[PDB]
Structure formats: C-alpha cells, structure tokens
C-alpha cells in the first residue's frame, strides 16, 4: 500500500469564458456569435498569424467542432466562406493594449496574486500525515488541440472539463472538499489525487504530487516535445526576435539581444545555478573585453575556469541593423570589466520567449538546437558505415560531441589526457599483435571484438578532449533521436545511456519516434 | 526480491560438426573450413525461402560470410557462389528426417540427452525453493531475422561463450563450472544469467519458468511469427494445395485440415483450452456436418452447448483438389463417422513447419484474426472517427469480425432480449433529456452520453452470438490497436481490461510502424 490517509482540496477548475459580443460573417451574412461559438472563434483568431490556420487538416478539424455549434445551419461551410475579421481585429486591439509597459505589469501582478491565492488553496495534500506539494492542480481551460505538429486531431476542440467529470482520490474518512465531484474513490494502490478523461483524446489525465516519478517523467517529456514543436516554426521565432530588437523599450531591446545569442550561439542566459553549465559562457557573464564589434562580424572571446578559452563569432552580413545597434547601445560608455547584459535573468528572457510561442524558454530553445545537430549529424551517416554495435555507439557519441560544441560545453582537458592517449595507443598496438598470433576461431573473434572497441575508443578519447558530453546528453538531446537511430540501424540504443539516464528517459520506451525515423529513412 | 539464489549456470550450445563440404566461387572449388561451412549450411537451410532472394538479406549475410576467407573474395556477389553441394546435403537429410523409420530412432536419442542436460542446468533454488528455469539453453549461432524488415536481416549471430555471460548468484553460493565473465549478486533482479547479443547489442536474460518476463517474451514471440507469416502466406497456400494433390493419403488429409485453417480459421480440435473447447474443430467434424454440393461446401455443426455454427465455402474459385479430397474422405461413411482419420496438432504443425519454420495452427489463426482486424480498420475513413466512443465502437466491431472469422460462436446471454430493451429505453430517454436541455453544459454532457448509448446499443445487437474476449486475449496482435490509436489520435488502452493491459505490457515499448504504414496509405 502507498498511503493510509490522503487529504486534499481537489483541483481548480478553469474560469468561465467572458463573451465580448463579437460576430463573424458566413457567405457575406452577419452572424452574432453565441458564447460557445465566440469562445472557439476567439481561440481560432489568436492563431491567425501562425501556420496552423493554413493547414488544411487543422482547418477541417476545427470546422468539425465549430460547425456543430450551429445545429440546423452551415453544415457544409468551408473555411474560406467564413470572415473572422471582426475577431481578428479584437485580438489586434488586445495586443494594442498589452503594448503599454505599465499595463503588462499590472496584469501580471494580479495574475500572480490570483495564482498565489489558488496555490495555497489547491496546491497541497496531506499523505500519511506529511504535507506534500501538488504539481498540476489546475485544470487547463478549453482550447484548440495541438500535438507535436502532425497529430491527427490537431485543430479539434478540447471541450471544457467540469467538477462533475472529475474523480478524486481520498482517504475513507477524509473530508470531501467543496465541489460537485463526479465520484470519490479510495485507491490505496495509486498515488494520484484526481483523474478525468480527456474529452477529445480519451486519455486519462491524472493530478500528481510534485517530485514524483510520474510528474518528473511528464515534465521531462514536455521539454523535448516543446523543442520538437519549434522545428517547424523556427523561422517565425527568429523574426520575432528581430522585432524585439526594434522595440521602443530599452529593457525589451536588451532581452531580445540575449535571445538572439541563444538562437545564433546556443548561449545560455547565465543565471542557472546548476553546476554542469555554471562555469561555461553565458549572456550575463559577458563583459566588454569579451566582445569586439567589427564591421564584418562580432567576435566573442571568453576565458573561463582553468584558463579554457572559448571563441565564437557571428557573421553580421545580411543581419538586421538592430543587432549591431543594441550591442552598441549596451556597449556605449562601458569600460573593461563592466557587464554588458545588466537587466537579464531567466525570468525576463523566458517571459519574452513565451510571448512568441507559449511555453518556449531558453532551455527548450537550446534543446531544439542540440537535438537538431544530433539528428543532422546522424542522418548524414550511410547505414553501410554502421557495421557493429561498437561503431553504432561511436557515431552516437560523435553526434553527442557535436551538440557539446554547439552548446559551448567546453572544458579543460582531463588531467592525464596525453598519457591516457599514450596508453590507449599501446593497447591497440598490443591488441593487434595478439590477434595476428591468435590461431583458433574463438580467440580470433574475441580479440577482434576487443580490438574494435579499442581503436574507436582511442579516436573518441582524442576528439572529446575539450568538451563535456554528459551535459547535453542528459539535458538537451531528445532521447527519441537515439532510439530512432537504434531502430534505423538495428543496434541497441540503450547502451548510449547510463542506468541513471535510462531511468530519467524511461518515457522514451513508450514514445513514438516516427517523426525522427522518417527523417533518417528519407 | 530474493536473498539466496543458487543454480548451475546455462548450457552452452554444442560446437559445429564439419561435414567436409565445398562451394564454387566463380568456377573455383573452395573447401570450406569449419566456420565457413557452419555459415554456408545455415544459408542452405533457407534455400527454399524468399529470404535468400532479398538483396538486403544477401548483402548482410555476405558481409559476415566473406570476412572468413582471409582477404579473398571480398567483392563476391551471391550470384557468383554455387552452393549446390551444401543444398544437396540439406535436402538429403531432409529426406532422411522425413522417413518414419528414421523418426523412430531420431526419437531414441531424444529420450536420453534432453533430460540429462535439463537436470544439470534447468533448475534453480531460490530461498530454499526449487524453481524450473525457462530458457537455460543458449541458442546456437545462426542467421539473424527480425519480423521481415529488420535492417540487420541476414547478418550472422556470433557464437556466445561462457566468458561473455554474467551469472547472478548468492554471495556465498558456489560458482558453478565454467569460465564465466562476470558474477554479480543483484537481489533486486529475478534473472539467473545475462549477456549482450553479439550482433544487436541487446541484453539477453535467462528467467525462471512461469514468470511474467518469460510469458511476455513468449507472448510477443507468437505475434511476431504471425506478422512474419504475412510474407509467406502465398507459399503456404500453394503448399497446402500441393499437399491436396499428393499421392500419399495421409498427406492429403493433413493438407485438407490445413486448408480448413486457411479458409475457415478452423482450429485443429485437440486444444484443451475451455475458451474454444466447445467450438467446431477439424477432429470433431463428422460426415453429417458437411454437405458437398455442386457449387459449394456447407458446414453445419451443433455443439454440446446447443450452439449452431454454419458456414459455406464457394467452390467457384477453389481448386478442384478441394472437392476431390473432400469426396475421398466422405465416401462410404455413415453420417456419424468422423471425416478425419488421424488428425492432431502435431501432424498439422509438422506439415506447416516444413513450409515455414515455426508455423503452427495457433500462429496461423493469430495471423488470420489480426489481418481481419487490420483490414476492417484500414477500410474506415479517418474522418468517420469523430470521438473516443466511435473509436472504441469500430475497434469492437473489428474484434467482432475476428470472433466470427475464428468461429468463436456462443449461446446468447441468458437475458439478452431484455438487455437490448433496456438499452433502447435509455436511448429514448436520453433523446428527450437532450430535447429538453437548456445550458450548453447540460446539452454537452447529455449528448455525449447519448452517442455512447446508441453506439453501445448497435454493438450489443451485433455481438449477441459471439465471444469477443477469446480473440482479443489470444489471437489479435495488440500492436494493431496501438497503431489504430496512433493513426486516429484516440486512446487505444481503453480497448483492454486491466488484465489484458498487464498481459500486453510488452506492446507499450513495441514498434507499430508495420501496421501504421498500412493504415497511412
């Protein structure tokens, strides 16, 4: 049994939709939208400047749910016959409002306040007398469904969930929290707190405690899913970065420049406390002496711990004048040893990123970069060159090395590197001789296998000298790429990972890799 | 999981026994050394299969085979090798093995050595309790095959030695004879031995019998064989018809029982599982059950459960040997006589196995049920699947189609007619509750229960005479439903009871690209 007492307050249900009295035109005919119809028309209009509303599968899926809200009429209307202009213009006026700086802060101040109030009410459970934080106590509002980009249900409506739909898991004598709950169960074999059926996909959705395997697996997978969603829309995200460089707010112009460094150099923000990256270059760690503004390029030169030198440059040819200007604007009147990015932290950068694509962050962005590098490297390898499990591992690690370079995970060489390389060279030379004196077939095969590992290990040890591969393998490389690599070639991809990493990526066993395997197989 | 564990390790495979065979390479006779012969013999055993015609299979095999000729013949293609000598050897011991006088003594050695190694290695003692070990024999080296399209099909599976194997034993447990490569004391694991597959790199484990790990392995194995049969079904059918033309009468009779598996998914009849024990089978078919007519064959079977099963075969496009052998078996018999004289699963599986190694009646019928389900779902337009409930509806209709195909007929539930009425009533009541609904919240919850009610009504009518659980549990590859879930977007897990989800746990990590591509055309 996992618990004897379980006490919580249930889940927070999403607030009702507030109608705005909007209308659309169908075949030139003005239709005043009812609440539900307007709610879906508004969700459609929010996506007006995205590719999704151009996708024919997306459109028909939306229309399947949208037209049902007009029972009796418009049963055969297609997407071109609907004029959403009135709803598009409302969304524009909404964006017009948020263009004011002090109007954004007051809205964020109250949404933080309402969130802090609801978190004290719903965010805590008592299990066997111990008070635990609840991870996902908020029921998501209805909206348009989106998957990784090619989901067969993309564009369908996610219908609203009510208290009557929800099952709570509680102790037998725990008080039943307020609400018209669908049912109360007492499932001592389960540590979920609430559950309901997704009204579109039929998948059961569970509320879990924080810091459990279930919530860690779900959030881990979510980061890589967001990174995969970026693959199709990286072009639009870049243009929005340049737009932030043209901002009239100085804080937003600086934040946009940091994001531009993420896109072009995979440079971290600089304020993550975690040790595996804390000593590598980052935006907030850049100082005037680390950057020299030239005419043809910007050149970066960072001296880190153990005197490891990191040097990269950005080509300024064909780049918008805003990148050079905001750099100049941040460089003007600053001496050596002075910080370039003074109003930068991850919260500011991620808020700016979230406005472009919801959920987008620096960590997701660099995950997309690292993962794409690994994919492209592996995709270029002819299958005939992958002649054994050992060679399969070799190429996977070389790809890991490429992502380490892209994400600037440079390091000082291991202390006895040259002498370690010395000893690997003598072992392979020793192993080659023992093979040419080995006579029977059992020993000729066993020594050939040990030899093959040795020469590839040797070449690897030389190439990985200056780079820490573990950081990107654990945090920034989608494990579905390696699983797909294993399916494509037929070799065991699980040997790429330590036991700890196999636990962290347990969710990849169940996950589809069709998206990547199709790329490998094209 | 365990604190004391003792066993004798694993039985390693016996070495290859050379035969002194030769091949011709570009007209040059080459005397094969042991390992070359072992590989050439493994290739010759597949001489009558389509694999030796697959260029990916050939090139993979040659990659390992040519490495054995000490630098020569590195660019030889399969067209430039004459395996005729090894082919002839394989055929002459196939002829030898097929002789029952040679099968009498072929058993004389199968009653001695089998039980002697099993006593040595096939038992473990854990916490003082004696448990049987499931897979204590390490399989011999051979040519690798996946489900038909594995990128390494044809590659050689190198021989495994004691030095590659890890043994899991107690801290003070005696280390058994052998040059084992590693001994561990892992108390959180129920496996006895482990090693890396020398081609794929996959970890292989030795488990105790009747455990969940061995059942999952053998469960997936059945469905893998059934999926592989999709690539051989044309040959199997042609071999069945050839068996019907055979000059040997026992062969004609075995072939007709196999033909009834193909055409009617008819079980052999001697399987003991009560899920099917009352249904028609070949061994229980009697003369009174069969009507041979001018344009058709009629089957009409009344079981011990008062269930009447009727099917007919249209003869207009069947080969004349079908009618011929049926006439042969029915001639001069009383209505109560059995049609089949000496038919059991061993005779049937021996006939099928000589066409496709490992093919059994159970695998054949798994292939049939699974194909039925795949074809039903592939014919459904994706836009018709508008909801989780409609998704489940079609999944169950496909399950019904397989149940009918495999003759899983049942007496109707004792209170069927009233249950249908109760389902009709709720459809009528829910229609009015939606005709009288006010808020969109109420109109949505009632309409969702309404469509669920009408779908369940149609289903309850259609499934009345059939036991769907039998094929769902035993004969339908769950990867078909996982693929259907991925193709449409809906939750396939809801097709299965919690027991079935446990049984089919292996499907969560399994690829479904094979079925998904079929759906996606």
TrEMBL record, chain A:
Organism: Caldiarchaeum subterraneum
PANTHER family noted in UniProt: DNA TOPOISOMERASE 1, DNA TOPOISOMERASE I
Pfam families listed in its UniProt record: Topo_C_assoc, Topoisom_I, Topoisom_I_N
SMART domains with a match to the protein in the record: TOPEUc
GO MF entries: DNA binding; DNA topoisomerase type I (single strand cut, ATP-independent) activity
Coiled-coil regions listed: 421-457
One of the record's GO cellular component terms: chromosome
Similarity comment text for this entry: Belongs to the type IB topoisomerase family.
Top-level lineage group: Archaea
GO biological process per UniProt: DNA topological change
Gene3D superfamilies from the UniProt entry: 1.10.132.10, DNA Topoisomerase I, domain 2, Topoisomerase I, Chain A, domain 3, Yeast DNA topoisomerase - domain 1
Protein name: DNA topoisomerase 1
Keywords: Coiled coil, DNA-binding, Isomerase, Topoisomerase
Domain DNA topoisomerase I eukaryotic-type positions: 144-490
Catalytic activity line of the entry: ATP-independent breakage of single-stranded DNA, followed by passage and rejoining
Enzyme Commission designation: 5.6.2.1
Record bears the keyword DNA-binding: yes
